[PDB]
Every structure is written in structure tokens, then in C-alpha cells.
Amino acid sequence: EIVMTQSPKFMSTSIGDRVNITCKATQNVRTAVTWYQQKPGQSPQALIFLASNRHTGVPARFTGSGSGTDFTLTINNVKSEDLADYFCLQHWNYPLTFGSGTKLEIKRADAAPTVSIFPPSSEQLTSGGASVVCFLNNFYPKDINVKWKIDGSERQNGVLNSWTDQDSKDSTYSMSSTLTLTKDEYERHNSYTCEATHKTSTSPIVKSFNRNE
Amino acid sequence: EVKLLESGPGLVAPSESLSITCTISGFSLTDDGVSWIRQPPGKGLEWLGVIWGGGSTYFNSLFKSRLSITRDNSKSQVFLEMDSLQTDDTAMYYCAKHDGHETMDYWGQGTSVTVSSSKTTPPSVYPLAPGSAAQTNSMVTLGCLVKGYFPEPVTVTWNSGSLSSGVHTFPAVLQSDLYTLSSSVTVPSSTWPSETVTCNVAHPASSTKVDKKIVPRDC
Numbered sequence: 267e268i269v270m271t272q273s274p275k276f277m278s279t280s281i282g283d284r285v286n287i288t289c290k291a292t293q294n295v296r297t298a299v300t301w302y303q304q305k306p307g308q309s310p311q312a313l314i315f316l317a318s319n320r321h322t323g324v325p326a327r328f329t330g331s332g333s334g335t336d337f338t339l340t341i342n343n344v345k346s347e348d349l350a351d352y353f354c355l356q357h358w359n360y361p362l363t364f365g366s367g368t369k370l371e372i373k374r375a376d377a378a379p380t381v382s383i384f385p386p387s388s389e390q391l392t393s394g395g396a397s398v399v400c401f402l403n404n405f406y407p408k409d410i411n412v413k414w415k416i417d418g419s420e421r422q423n424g425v426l427n428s429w430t431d432q433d434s435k436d437s438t439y440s441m442s443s444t445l446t447l448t449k450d451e452y453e454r455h456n457s458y459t460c461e462a463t464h465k466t467s468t469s470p471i472v473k474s475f476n477r478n479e
Numbered sequence: 480e481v482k483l484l485e486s487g488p489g490l491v492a493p494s495e496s497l498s499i500t501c502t503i504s505g506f507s508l509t510d511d512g513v514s515w516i517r518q519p520p521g522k523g524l525e526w527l528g529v530i531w532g533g534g535s536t537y538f539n540s541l542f543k544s545r546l547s548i549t550r551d552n553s554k555s556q557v558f559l560e561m562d563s564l565q566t567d568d569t570a571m572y573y574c575a576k577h578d579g580h581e582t583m584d585y586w587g588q589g590t591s592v593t594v595s596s597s598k599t600t601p602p603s604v605y606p607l608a609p610g611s612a613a614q615t616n617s618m619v620t621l622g623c624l625v626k627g628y629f630p631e632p633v634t635v636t637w638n639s640g641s642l643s644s645g646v647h648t649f650p651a652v653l654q655s656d657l658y659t660l661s662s663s664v665t666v667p668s669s670t671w672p673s674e675t676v677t678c679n680v681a682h683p684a685s686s687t688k689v690d691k692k693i694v695p696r697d698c
């Protein structure tokens with residue numbers, strides 16, 4: 267059965283540029299190709315149907331082209347709302363098959379993270395748990411290191427991280443770092459520290475609190 | 480005005496059947512195909528099968544043996560049944576309209592299916608209020624830590640949806656068979672705590688909702 271290969275897994279570009287995401291079929295006498303946009307955490311939207319036709323309410327800067335094997339979704343004048351995964355569906359033969367997709371990355375200016383640290387809630391403590399949370403919000407590029415320190419000494423154990431996708435407005439990323447300890451460990455120490463190292467400064471951004479204060 | 484809405488189980492035990500209902504509006508099942516497609520965690524989309532306008536069905540040969548697709552014309556519902564679920568049937572399951580007998584023009588919201596033996600566990604929701612007045616910034620960031628739930632997903636909003644600018648809801652992480660996520664919101668400092676901020680967490684699998692108000696700390 268027909269494979270749709272999208273050889274770029276990630277495609278990089280600037281606001282107002284032109285980008286082509288390509289999709290190369292394993293067979294076909296077809297213009298039986300549809301193109302979709304899936305923005306993070308929601309459902310796909312048809313952009314282009316029958317290789318080179320525009321779905322209603324799709325703005326004029328999205329165009330499609332190609333025959334047989336190779337197909338090209340062109341995005342002119344890229345906007346930040348175009349942050350999404352773009353993929354083709356082959357509908358010439360059964361089974362219908364999908365490209366694995368190209369996530370468009372938008373290049374923007376370096377921005378430093380806004381860092382905030384939060385002690386365990388007292389609700390969490392009354393339950394025997396103690397999570398310390400640190401948000402590093404709205405920074406670029408994505409590359410970032412978080413160091414946790416307890417009474418001045420690095421903890422790598424019990425730190426769980428999670429990154430958002432690139433924001434569709436400001437093209438930034440954000441990250442959440444949670445240090446999970448038990449209440450029993452948490453109460454034996456005073457000083458808790460989140461340190462964010464980002465290319466935007468050679469100095470770490472340091473957020474801390476004392477449990478006793 | 481074409482809409483499609485999956486309703487499914489959220490959690491399914493190994494070897495039990497999945498069934499999902501796709502309720503549609505804005506077209507007639509009679510005139511258009513409806514396909515079922517899925518997206519397992521970090522993999523391509525996979526088409527499962529279709530039921531066309533005139534009633535006939537084709538399936539992906541991979542699933543033929545345990546798939547069935549039917550519909551109820553009078554309710555505008557397409558039903559999927561997939562038997563013998565194994566953990567690798569975990570995925571987001573979508574139904575989608577066709578343009579008659581051609582293009583898949585419109586996609587439903589998707590419903591998450593996790594194949595697992597374990598219990599449903601609701602989240603504990605913990606408010607994240609800043610530590611002792613760590614200065615005036617003109618903005619304050621607040622959060623909810625949503626800990627200890629299974630399966631995915633949870634939905635987070637703030638003041639029931641009125642507060643949507645400057646929200647980050649992070650993907651969940653899995654530790655010791657339970658998920659955890661956190662969400663932040665940033666509002667002007669003059670306005671909190673005088674104008675209240677509450678995160679609302681829905682965990683559909685467990686039919687639970689918690690609305691947690693963020694109050695400044697006592698410490």
C-alpha cells in the first residue's frame with residue numbers, strides 16, 4: 267500500500283517568508299492528494315484538496331501543486347498562526363495513507379525566560395507530598411537548562427520537565443520544571459532554587475525561596 | 480457549520496472492545512462518507528476505515544479483522560467498534576467528513592483512548608500562589624499543579640475560560656503510572672488577589688471537575 271514520505275520532520279522559517287513542505291508518494295497516476303494543518307492540541311484543517319485547489323476560508327497565500335509522486339504545499343508570507351504540523355493524505359487507493367508530517371518552526375529574536383518558583387501548597391503538604399514548581403515562560407530559542415538546588419546543592423533526582431509548543435502569537439516556548447520530593451525530604455531542608463540558563467544571558471536566572479521564611 | 484464530535488470511553492481494558500460515537504451536524508450521512516482515523520503517541524495518522532454515503536464500508540487491511548463501522552441516519556451518528564484492544568491501540572481517535580465520495584474535508588475534535596488495566600484516578604489540584612510577596616513586578620504569575628491522574632487528558636481553564644491571555648498549560652509527564660501537569664497564568668499585580676483567579680480542571684475519564692481558587696499565601 268501507498269507510503270507518503272515527508273522527508274523533512276521539522277521545517278524552519280521566518281515571519282513573511284515562503285516555505286514549501288513536500289510530500290513524495292510511493293506510487294500514482296494521482297492528483298488525489300489533500301493537505302492539512304494541525305495546530306498543537308487541536309484537530310486538522312484541510313488547506314488544499316485535489317493537489318491544487320483551496321478549501322473555503324483558507325487564505326490566498328496557501329497553494330498546492332504537483333502530479334503523480336511529488337506534491338508541494340507552499341505557504342507564502344508566513345504568519346505566526348501558521349505554527350502547525352502540515353501533512354498530506356493520499357486518497358487514490360485503499361488504504362488512505364498519510365504523510366508523517368512536517369512541523370513548521372518559526373525563527374524569531376532571542377528572548378529570555380520569565381522565571382517563577384512556587385513552594386509546595388499546604389494542601390499538598392497535608393497529603394504527604396511536596397512538589398516545587400518552576401515556570402520558565404516565553405523564551406527563545408527552545409534550548410534551555412534548568413538546574414535545581416537544595417540548600418545550595420544540585421538535585422537532579424525527581425525533576426520532571428515539560429515544554430510547550432511554540433506560541434502562535436509571539437513564537438516563544440515555555441517550560442515547566444517540577445521538583446517532586448516527599449514532605450519528609452522537603453521539611454529537612456530550607457533553601458530551594460530554580461536556575462535557568464539560556465543563551466540570552468551568560469548569567470543564570472535564579473529563583474529561590476526559603477521554606478523557613 | 481459542518482461539525483463532528485467523538486464521544487468515547489477514555490479508558491479501555493486489554494482485550495475489551497472500543498466503541499466511539501461520532502455525532503455530526505451540518506451535512507447528511509447519506510450524502511457523505513465519514514472515516515475513522517487515529518494518531519498513536521508520536522506516530523503518523525492511520526486511517527482505519529470509512530462508511531460512504533450509500534452505506535458501504537472499506538477498512539484498512541491492518542484492522543479488518545476486528546473493526547466495524549455502522550451509523551444511525553436519524554441521529555446523524557457514525558459508530559466505531561474495534562475489538563481486542565491492546566496497549567498499542569492507545570491513540571487519539573478522529574472521525575472526519577468526506578466531500579461526498581472524495582476528500583476528507585472536516586475533522587472532529589478527536590477523542591483520547593488509553594488501553595490499560597489500571598484504575599481511573601482523578602487528579603489532585605494544587606494552587607501555586609507566589610511565595611511571600613517576592614517583590615512587586617507589575618505582572619504576577621500564578622499556577623495550578625494537576626497531579627496524580629490517569630488516564631489522559633485533563634482540561635485546564637482559568638475563571639471558567641474568561642482568562643485566556645498569558646496562559647501556559649504544559650504537556651503532562653508520566654511518573655510511576657500517574658500523570659502530572661501544571662498550568663500558569665500571568666495577570667496584572669494590581670488585580671490579584673482583589674479580582675479572583677481560579678483554575679478549573681476537568682478530568683473526563685473520571686467525570687471529575689475541581690475549581691481551585693488561588694489565594695495569596697499565609698506563611
Ligand SMILES: *[C@@H]1O[C@H](CO[C@H]2O[C@H](C)[C@@H](O)[C@@H](O)[C@@H]2O)[C@@H](O[C@@H]2O[C@H](CO)[C@@H](O)[C@H](O)[C@H]2NC(C)=O)[C@H](O)[C@H]1NC(C)=O
Nearest residue numbers: 284285286287327329330331332337338339340341342343
Ligand atoms: C517553492 O515553490 C514555489 C511554487 O512551486 C511551484 O513552482 C515550482 C517551480 C515547482 O517546483 C513546484 O514546487 C510548483 O509547481 C516556487 O516558485 C515561485 O513561487 C510561486 C508561488 O509562491 C509560484 O507560483 C511561481 O511560479 C514562482 N515564481 C515565479 C515564476 O516568479 C518557489 O521557488 C519555491 N521556493 C523555494 C524556496 O523552493
